[PDB]
Amino acid sequence: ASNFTQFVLVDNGGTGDVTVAPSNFANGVAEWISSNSRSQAYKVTCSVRQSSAQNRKYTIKVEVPKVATQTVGGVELPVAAWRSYLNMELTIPIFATNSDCELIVKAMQGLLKDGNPIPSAIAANSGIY
Amino acid sequence: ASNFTQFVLVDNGGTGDVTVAPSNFANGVAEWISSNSRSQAYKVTCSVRQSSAQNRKYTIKVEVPKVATQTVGGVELPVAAWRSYLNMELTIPIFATNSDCELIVKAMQGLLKDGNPIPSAIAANSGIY
Amino acid sequence: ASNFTQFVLVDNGGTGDVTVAPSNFANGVAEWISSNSRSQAYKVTCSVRQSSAQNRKYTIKVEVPKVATQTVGGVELPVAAWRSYLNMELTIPIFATNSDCELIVKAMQGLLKDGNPIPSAIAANSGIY
Amino acid sequence: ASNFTQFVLVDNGGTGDVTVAPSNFANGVAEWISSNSRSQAYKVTCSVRQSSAQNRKYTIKVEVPKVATQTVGGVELPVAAWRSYLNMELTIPIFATNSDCELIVKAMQGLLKDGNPIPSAIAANSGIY
Amino acid sequence: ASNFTQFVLVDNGGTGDVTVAPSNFANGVAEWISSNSRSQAYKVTCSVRQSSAQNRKYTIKVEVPKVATQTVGGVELPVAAWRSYLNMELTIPIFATNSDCELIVKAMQGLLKDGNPIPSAIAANSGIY
Amino acid sequence: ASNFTQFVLVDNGGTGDVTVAPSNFANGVAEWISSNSRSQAYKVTCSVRQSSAQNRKYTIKVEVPKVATQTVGGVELPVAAWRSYLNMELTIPIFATNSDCELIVKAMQGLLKDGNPIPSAIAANSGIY
RNA sequence: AUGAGGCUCACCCAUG
RNA sequence: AUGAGGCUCACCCAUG
RNA sequence: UGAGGCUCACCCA
RNA sequence: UGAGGCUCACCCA
């Protein structure tokens, strides 16, 4: 058993799919990275800690890079023109059962489901209106 | 046109579906709340601001309550035994096109897709392993 | 292979069996918990360390809870009336072969076998006499 | 009901079985040892005390010898190279009933049952993976 | 794509082959060891980390036992007289692509190929001359 | 004999093969470089030292460059965009015979053999999972 | 000596 | 390191 | 704690 | 900035 495995971060059908694979798990911080130049890679990190007596707290991070080539003095390197940073923290009381978590997850999936307000706004450089 | 509308936060097929509807949009902070007692309601807030010169930054929040009845002196009130707090911040450079955002969104949808590491861990009071 | 799998902690003839599963491997400490709220779960943790230049030390910890339903602030919460803690440390020389280690496991199995002195005293709230 | 009697520590199905028998009872600390020189014997000690006002605590200790290349009766130094030490401490709240204690024994039996992670990792000089 | 599997460390054409298999994964440091007491086993550990902002670094460690006059299972001291230690550190800039990395692996394969200086000097207790 | 000879560092089916040759033995450090400008050359260095009273230590270093053509001061110069560094130290007891040393070489050859875990992770920019 | 310490890589650091 | 030291249990204490 | 900031497991009030 | 905390658009280093 193990969930620290390779998975599809971006789904482009079956071709162009961005896959992220395990890379390091030091200090309680699991890290996934896509293939090729670390400089142009997608990155996902996750960790859980007992934030307070009654709370456990997940801290997840995602990085989406803008793949580009940097030329300098005629020396071209694979870099990331820029990066987009996702950064969430989920807090769950110790009284939550597996059923309660399953709900908390369905909530997060719904929040971003296609067509709903928030993901629709983000995908259009827009806000709410 | 408008995206500040009612939407399904939790999808339980077609029955038990948690729907959240607009409630207030003051100070650039859009807010959605489920029906019935505000005390046991789901809550979603979202806002966008120009964080720096080159960055725009979304700040999204979700609250999942544990619906319960509080009895005191024989007076029972609808309350929330506890609450789970989602709290994300997404940063996107001003050079991102609509195509780049569409990707950033597909990344977030994949992160939480059923069966993948992170949502699977959360739904089981577990961490990575 | 991979030995980080779920297993039956308390065997009750396939009915009322407390089965524990992998839940976290952060910081080199493997963890298993039962399908309960993290506040009423059985918990087993294991970890191996090269304690000395010529030794290895396994540290195993097991928590058995007495589940209950406390009514705090006039609200019902799943909780543990009390917990029983098992803490064991096994130190094995590096010179011990596999057939030497198999011998240690067998000793620990026979120690707690039904009907033998120790598990007999424990289960009857008495000492050895 | 005297439960201080000899028992089988290592069971090899009749042939090659290791029997441990009463050898000392000084200070309420019962001791069982095999029929060997004390430097190569299997030893088991066990005692109970009221650790604190809320708990009771069993302290069980097992010493198992390294047999591969052992020289029966001979002098083998350094001693730490030829012995593995087990060290258990079971804490049980004063509210635990006989039935509660039986469950705590079952939990310990299951922990070490054949084919489960822990006893499998140990018997192979491995950790969890 | 799980690449953490058993493999052949010492190949003697089928007969007398030394297989090393997964034995630990604590702290993201994967460990492989042969079927021996830990004092005489072949051991392999490997990990990756972002050494600096510009680099990534693999730290591979191999422990190989002295076999001539070895006493299988026995206690052999001093330990430093019966073990050879390998210690590799591969630094790879973040700009290196998969293809670049393949070439770096080929470079390492060639370094140690049969009949080349280095592996020839080592296998004969010699230096370069 | 004399083992200080040239050899193939990177094998590309006799075409595009990076062959390295002896270039310096000053200060007890044998050196090999490729037929390039000293600024874009592959470099391999080896040296043996009687580190301890009972040990010998081989220190091997390999540099793999990413050749490029920088335009400094408006002039074209052959240079290295970046370098990848391999640094290995092998410590072998003086008691190790030739057949013991041959065993070490074979272990290091199998470690990097195509298809095995480590060279597989390295060539795909990932860790072991 | 030891470090899953660091480098622009036969150098630097920490510890002991 | 060692403790038939302690806990609300991957923490605290004592000694050395 | 923050609709505090970042070159993102860092920094700030 | 933080794998800083919360009763969650607040507070902290």
Coordinates of N, CA and C in Angstrom, one line a residue, chain A residues 109-129, chain B residues 2-9 18-23 25 30-33 44-48 58 60 88 90 105 108-109:
Chain A
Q109 N -14.3 19.5 -4.5 CA -14.4 19.1 -5.9 C -15.5 19.9 -6.6
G110 N -16.6 20.2 -5.9 CA -17.7 21.0 -6.4 C -17.3 22.4 -6.6
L111 N -16.5 23.0 -5.6 CA -16.1 24.4 -5.7 C -15.5 24.6 -7.1
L112 N -14.6 23.7 -7.5 CA -13.9 23.9 -8.8 C -14.5 23.2 -10.0
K113 N -15.7 22.5 -9.9 CA -16.3 21.8 -11.0 C -16.5 22.8 -12.2
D114 N -16.3 22.3 -13.4 CA -16.5 23.1 -14.6 C -17.9 23.8 -14.7
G115 N -17.9 25.0 -15.0 CA -19.2 25.7 -15.1 C -19.6 26.5 -13.9
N116 N -19.1 26.1 -12.7 CA -19.5 26.8 -11.6 C -18.8 28.2 -11.5
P117 N -19.3 29.2 -10.8 CA -18.7 30.5 -10.6 C -17.2 30.6 -10.5
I118 N -16.6 30.2 -9.4 CA -15.2 30.3 -9.3 C -14.2 29.8 -10.3
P119 N -14.3 28.6 -10.8 CA -13.4 28.1 -11.8 C -13.6 28.9 -13.1
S120 N -14.9 29.3 -13.3 CA -15.2 30.0 -14.6 C -14.6 31.4 -14.6
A121 N -14.6 32.0 -13.4 CA -14.0 33.3 -13.3 C -12.5 33.3 -13.5
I122 N -11.8 32.3 -12.8 CA -10.4 32.2 -12.9 C -10.0 31.9 -14.4
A123 N -10.7 31.0 -15.0 CA -10.3 30.7 -16.4 C -10.6 31.8 -17.4
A124 N -10.9 33.0 -16.9 CA -11.2 34.1 -17.8 C -10.6 35.4 -17.3
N125 N -9.6 35.3 -16.5 CA -8.9 36.5 -16.0 C -10.0 37.4 -15.4
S126 N -11.1 36.8 -14.9 CA -12.1 37.6 -14.3 C -12.4 37.4 -12.8
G127 N -13.2 38.3 -12.3 CA -13.6 38.2 -10.9 C -15.1 37.9 -10.8
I128 N -15.7 38.2 -9.7 CA -17.1 37.8 -9.7 C -17.9 39.0 -10.1
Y129 N -19.1 38.8 -10.7 CA -19.9 39.9 -11.1 C -21.3 39.4 -11.5
Chain B
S2 N -23.8 37.2 -15.7 CA -23.5 37.2 -14.3 C -23.0 35.8 -13.9
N3 N -22.0 35.8 -13.0 CA -21.5 34.5 -12.5 C -21.7 34.5 -11.0
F4 N -22.2 35.6 -10.5 CA -22.5 35.6 -9.1 C -23.8 35.0 -8.9
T5 N -23.9 33.7 -9.1 CA -25.1 32.9 -8.9 C -25.1 31.7 -8.0
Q6 N -26.2 31.1 -7.9 CA -26.4 29.9 -7.1 C -25.8 28.7 -7.8
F7 N -25.2 27.8 -7.0 CA -24.5 26.7 -7.6 C -24.4 25.5 -6.6
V8 N -24.1 24.3 -7.2 CA -24.0 23.1 -6.3 C -22.6 22.9 -5.7
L9 N -22.5 23.1 -4.4 CA -21.2 22.9 -3.7 C -21.0 21.4 -3.5
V18 N -26.0 19.9 -1.8 CA -25.9 21.1 -1.0 C -25.7 22.2 -2.0
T19 N -26.7 23.2 -2.0 CA -26.7 24.3 -2.9 C -26.3 25.5 -2.1
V20 N -25.5 26.4 -2.7 CA -25.1 27.6 -2.1 C -25.6 28.7 -3.0
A21 N -26.1 29.8 -2.4 CA -26.7 30.9 -3.2 C -26.0 32.2 -2.8
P22 N -26.0 33.2 -3.7 CA -25.4 34.5 -3.4 C -26.1 35.1 -2.1
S23 N -25.3 35.9 -1.4 CA -25.9 36.4 -0.2 C -25.4 37.9 0.0
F25 N -22.3 40.9 -1.5 CA -21.1 41.2 -2.3 C -20.6 42.6 -1.9
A30 N -17.2 38.5 -2.7 CA -18.5 37.8 -3.0 C -18.7 36.7 -2.0
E31 N -19.9 36.5 -1.5 CA -20.2 35.5 -0.5 C -21.5 34.7 -0.9
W32 N -21.3 33.4 -0.7 CA -22.4 32.5 -1.0 C -22.7 31.7 0.3
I33 N -24.0 31.4 0.6 CA -24.4 30.7 1.8 C -25.5 29.7 1.4
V44 N -19.2 30.1 1.2 CA -18.1 30.2 0.2 C -17.9 31.7 -0.1
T45 N -16.6 32.2 0.0 CA -16.3 33.6 -0.3 C -15.2 33.6 -1.3
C46 N -15.1 34.6 -2.1 CA -14.1 34.7 -3.2 C -13.9 36.2 -3.5
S47 N -12.6 36.5 -3.8 CA -12.3 37.9 -4.2 C -11.0 37.9 -5.0
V48 N -10.8 39.0 -5.8 CA -9.6 39.1 -6.6 C -9.0 40.5 -6.4
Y58 N -6.2 35.6 -6.2 CA -7.6 35.2 -5.8 C -7.5 34.6 -4.4
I60 N -9.9 32.4 -2.0 CA -11.1 31.7 -1.8 C -11.2 31.0 -0.5
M88 N -7.8 28.8 0.3 CA -6.8 28.9 -0.7 C -6.5 30.3 -1.3
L90 N -4.7 31.8 -4.9 CA -4.1 31.5 -6.2 C -3.5 32.8 -6.8
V105 N -6.6 26.0 -14.1 CA -7.8 25.5 -13.6 C -7.8 24.0 -13.7
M108 N -6.0 22.5 -10.9 CA -6.7 22.4 -9.7 C -7.7 21.3 -9.6
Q109 N -8.4 21.1 -10.8 CA -9.4 20.1 -10.8 C -8.7 18.7 -10.7

